[PDB]
């Protein structure tokens with residue numbers, strides 16, 4: 001299916017309520033904003049970050065910055081619930097030495113999407129990315145190392161954690177338009193946390 005990927009469905013179910021309270025706390029310092037891609041187009045996914053470094057869009061491309069380009073202040077600290085859940089997920093996946101210094105928080109409104117891309121801004125591509133899904137379900141689509149590779153679909157639901165390691169770490173991926181619906185903890189959206197080793 002996906003070489004190197006360890007899928008832990010509903011792993012973050014118990015931590016969900018606290019993770020959502022902490023997303024709101026992070027958002028009060030560094031608000032969710034729809035980032036502008038280097039070409040001048042606003043993304044449909046709303047983003048923010050927590051930790052020492054944060055994923056951002058810039059004029060010359062994409063980069064990690066210790067400063068929030070909107071607030072001009074540092075990104076909020078990595079919440080304890082975030083650190084604990086990532087550590088437990090990474091350890092269960094065979095990565096006990098994984099220490100993330102960045103967590104990109106994505107918010108998906110109904111219809112929000114993320115087109116095919118590779119995560120290649122990190123210094124060591126051998127280091128995995130821990131993905132945590134919360135709220136409304138979304139269809140995650142992935143291919144291979146090159147753009148013309150056949151697409152495979154995977155539904156990511158509330159509490160689903162995937163540790164993208166090995167070959168899966170380099171796969172082209174995205175999110176199909178979020179279907180409208182209801183979730184008791186997020187109301188009308190989906191949140192996705194992606195823990196990265198960026199320094």
Ligand SMILES: O=C(O)CCC(=O)C(=O)O
Pocket residue numbers: 104106114119131140156173174175192194
């Ligand atoms: O929403 C997701 O599950 C994927 C997010 C993603 O690929 C990213 O922000 O780089």
Ligand SMILES: [Fe+2]
Pocket residue numbers: 117118119173
């Ligand atoms: Fe990505």
